[PDB]
Every structure is written in C-alpha cells, then in structure tokens.
C-alpha cells in the first residue's frame with residue numbers, strides 16, 4: 001500500500017465495473033502503456049464487418065487528460081482485427097460505458113470474440129486544452145518561417161510513389 | 163477574459179481560417195480532448211474509397227508539441243468512416259492546410275460528407291523530441307532486464323488466436 | 325555537442341540497429357513529432373492484404389513513456405497504405421524489434437515496399453501509469469455531474485447520419 005517515492009505523482013482513475021463478472025483492466029507487464037479492456041460480449045465479425053462492443057467499464061478520465069483506446073498488436077497481425085475510430089478518444093467528461101468499434105480487416109476469415117477476451121487497450125495521457133487564437137496569417141502572429149513550411153503528405157519522400 | 167487560476171498554464175494555438183465560412187473548431191463539451199474539424203467540401207465516398215479532404219484551417223502547433231487528427235466515434239460506428247493515416251500527425255513546423263484522409267470502411271453504403279459537417283477532431287499534446295543514443299546492445303547501455311523482454315504481438319494471450 | 329538551454333530537458337532513447345545497413349530513424353524537419361522508421365525488407369501487398377514488417381531497430385522507451393507507431397500521411401493518401409493496429413503501442417519494457425503491421429486499404433493497386441523505404445513514424449510521449457480506483461458509482465466517488473454525461477458515439481451531431 002506504500003506509494004514508492006518514484007510513483008508519488010501517479011494518477012488515479014475512477015472505474016465502475018458495469019459488468020462485475022469481468023476482471024479489472026490491467027497492464028500485462030510493468031511499465032506497459034495501457035490496461036487491457038475486456039469484451040463483455042460474444043460477437044462474430046465476418047470479413048469487412050464492424051461491431052460496437054461493450055467493455056463492461058466506465059471511467060472518469062481526469063480533467064486535463066484523455067483516455068485513448070488502441071488496438072492490440074497480436075490480434076491485428078494474426079486475424080486482422082482493428083478499431084474503426086482508432087485511437088478512440090475518451091473525453092474527461094464521459095461517464096458512459098467504454099465501447100470499442102471493432103472491425104475485421106481480413107478479406108476471408110471471420111473473427112470470433114468471446115466474452116472475457118482482451119480486445120483493446122486503454123491509455124491515459126495529458127492533453128492540451130487549446131485556446132485558439134485566430135490570426136489573419138502566421139506572419140501577423142509574428143511567427144518565424146519554418147523548415148517544413150506547407151510541406152506535408154509525403155513531401156519528404158522515402159517511397160517511389162511520393 | 164479572465165484566465166482562471168486553474169487554466170493559467172493552458173496553451174494557445176494560432177489558427178488561420180483559410181475558409182472563413184466555417185466556424186472555428188470547438189470542443190463539444192468542457193474537458194473534451196479535441197476540437198472538431200469541419201469539412202470545407204462536399205465529397206461522396208463509395209465503399210472502400212478514400213479522399214483527401216480540406217478542413218479550411220491551418221494551425222501552428224507549438225514546438226515541443228504535436229497535433230493529432232482522430233476520427234469521430236459516431237461516424238465510425240454508424241457509417242464506417244475512418245481515417246487512413248489515423249492518428250494524423252501534425253508537426254509543429256507545419257503551416258499548410260490541415261487535410262483529412264477519409265476512407266469508407268463500409269462494404270456497401272456510400273458516405274456523403276457535406277461542407278460544414280464535423281468529420282474529425284484535433285488534439286494537441288506534448289511530444290518528446292527524442293535524442294537517439296545508438297548502443298550495441300541494451301546490456302551495454304547497462305539497462306536492466308525487463309518483465310516484457312522481447313514479448314510482443316499477442317505474447318500476453320487473451321484470445322484463442324494468440 | 326552543446327545541449328541548448330532550450331533542450332536541456334530532452335529525452336534520450338537508446339536504440340539498437342538490428343539491421344546496421346539502414347540509417348538511424350530521423351525527423352524530416354526540426355520540430356517534427358516523430359522519427360521515420362525504415363523497412364528492413366521488400367514486401368508486396370495486394371489489395372486488402374497485411375504484412376508484419378521488420379524495421380531493423382529495437383528501442384528502450386523510458387519507463388513512464390510510450391512509443392507510438394503512426395502511419396505516414398503521403399503513403400496513406402497516395403496508395404492507401406495503413407497500419408492495422410495504428411497507433412502501434414510500444415511499451416517501455418519492450419526490448420524486441422519494432423515491427424509494423426502494414427495493410428493495403430486500396431481496392432485495386434498493390435503496394436510495393438522496398439528495403440530502405442520510410443514506412444511509418446515513431447513518436448515518444450509521456451503516459452500516465454494509471455492506478456485504478458474501483459467505485460460503485462461516480463456519485464460515491466463524489467464526482468460532479470458533467471456536461472457530456474454518458475453522451476458519446478455522435479451525440480453532439482455534425483452529420484446527417486447522427
């Protein structure tokens with residue numbers, strides 16, 4: 001129960017298990033970035049299909065932070081599982097159930113998810129709650145020219161298509 | 163106009179409305195992680211098709227930060243809308259128009275986007291501007307062994323496929 | 325070799341080039357959020373197919389941070405290249421090779437990746453290593469009501485489908 005001096009600053013996350021039959025989300029290994037979310041339900045996804053899957057939890061992301069729902073890498077490579085809105089963006093004011101928009105990006109093999117499978121991971125990070133300052137031009141804001149300028153969308157090269 | 167003591171530290175984001183006919187991006191609710199980006203154009207996406215869509219804004223993400231373009235959850239589940247390069251990564255030096263690489267992941271129904279629809283959200287976060295230190299092995303860097311080791315890509319289990 | 329007073333706080337990332345024939349990952353422009361990852365191999369992706377591609381590097385993300393593998397925007401729009409598990413989540417304890425789960429989201433044109441192409445970018449950010457506090461209800465935790473409440477999944481509108 002002792003908070004190591006190292007962890008004095010670590011953030012608490014209130015969580016409600018809407019489905020008490022599932023374990024609390026946990027990190028697979030010390031230092032892992034996210035806690036794994038469970039599926040509360042059985043669902044089968046044919047190739048190309050998506051589903052909105054309940055995780056059985058609600059959280060209270062602190063004000064000034066964001067929760068982020070990321071796909072797991074193993075299911076992504078092994079069976080083509082993804083998340084339509086990845087990274088899913090959990091707002092600090094949200095008090096509903098976290099759901100995951102799973103999608104089967106494999107062309108031929110269905111994906112079967114069972115209740116209690118670990119289907120995604122939840123990260124928590126600080127976010128800047130931006131105050132927009134509208135300007136007529138970045139010059140007017142007295143901003144210096146930058147190296148990148150308006151270069152984007154492959155401008156630096158690195159593939160034959162670019 | 164008073165900055166609450168709580169918000170003293172909040173980050174300003176210079177923004178140019180390249181399309182002045184669109185509202186400034188805004189947070190839907192207090193504490194929300196992102197501001198919603200508008201489409202500056204009408205575009206129809208057949209199943210499987212993608213488009214590079216103008217948002218009508220340019221921003222100056224502060225040095226030491228990153229802008230992040232995330233899909234909205236409702237369009238993702240309701241109509242299969244996604245973003246090919248999600249999360250889109252807006253560099254601090256970028257001064258061009260923010261564009262969104264929308265894609266229709268539904269197998270059968272086209273997606274119609276109208277000018278003035280909210281099609282994505284923009285977050286701003288700090289980023290570590292990494293100094294790489296090349297080493298011959300993590301041992302040489304005197305790094306301690308870790309629990310995870312070289313485990314990845316589903317190593318912790320949690321689905322029948324893994 | 326002088327660390328500018330401005331960069332005193334900048335984070336070092338230990339890296340092993342498992343494939344020494346590839347350049348170290350680098351930022352395309354000052355201030356860019358990520359370093360570009362190379363492919364260590366040649367791979368051809370037919371429409372809809374995915375592959376697990378080696379980058380030739382291993383890193384040691386600091387404890388309290390996360391590495392994030394993001395797609396590049398140019399390949400995403402030009403040829404439909406994406407990443408199945410985007411954003412890929414590199415844990416601080418991981419000492420294996422970084423791999424990228426590339427996928428071809430174009431319906432008709434194959435994507436050819438050559439060894440030495442820049443196929444993704446790696447960001448490093450702080451992460452909150454969450455301590456979960458289970459509560460019976462957010463009321464019990466004495467949390468105030470929020471504007472958003474349980475609204476999600478398009479609740480704020482902004483498209484005809486919502």
Ligand SMILES: O=c1ccn([C@H]2C[C@H](O)[C@@H](COP(=O)(O)NP(=O)(O)OP(=O)(O)O)O2)c(=O)[nH]1
Pocket residue numbers: 151152153154155156157231247249250251252253254256259260261262263352395396397398399445
């Ligand atoms: O969703 C996005 C992503 C990028 N961009 C712009 C801003 C960003 O700084 C720039 C380059 O983004 P990436 O580095 O993610 N893509 P890529 O490496 O292909 O382009 P470049 O070669 O210019 O770095 O493109 C957008 O407008 N929207």
Ligand SMILES: O=c1ccn([C@H]2C[C@H](O)[C@@H](COP(=O)(O)NP(=O)(O)OP(=O)(O)O)O2)c(=O)[nH]1
Pocket residue numbers: 028071072073074075121313314315316317318319393409411412413414415416418421422423424425
């Ligand atoms: O794009 C990625 C993502 C993950 N990885 C490696 C490093 C990360 O620490 C490890 C596990 O990532 P995930 O936790 O996102 N996937 P999963 O939960 O399936 O694997 P594990 O069960 O090992 O945690 O896989 C990559 O090499 N590239």
Ligand SMILES: O=c1ccn([C@H]2C[C@H](O)[C@@H](COP(=O)(O)NP(=O)(O)OP(=O)(O)O)O2)c(=O)[nH]1
Pocket residue numbers: 069085087088089090091092094097098099100101190233234235236237283475476477478479480481
């Ligand atoms: O993966 C996710 C993403 C969002 N959500 C919930 C929490 C988040 O606060 C809420 C809204 O998320 P978005 O803002 O990303 N989507 P959208 O803009 O469509 O919904 P809203 O109009 O309610 O903001 O939906 C999930 O449960 N899982």
Ligand SMILES: [Mg+2]
Pocket residue numbers: 028072121318
């Ligand atoms: Mg994992």
Ligand SMILES: [Mg+2]
Pocket residue numbers: 190234283480
């Ligand atoms: Mg929203």
Ligand SMILES: [Mg+2]
Pocket residue numbers: 156352396445
């Ligand atoms: Mg780039």
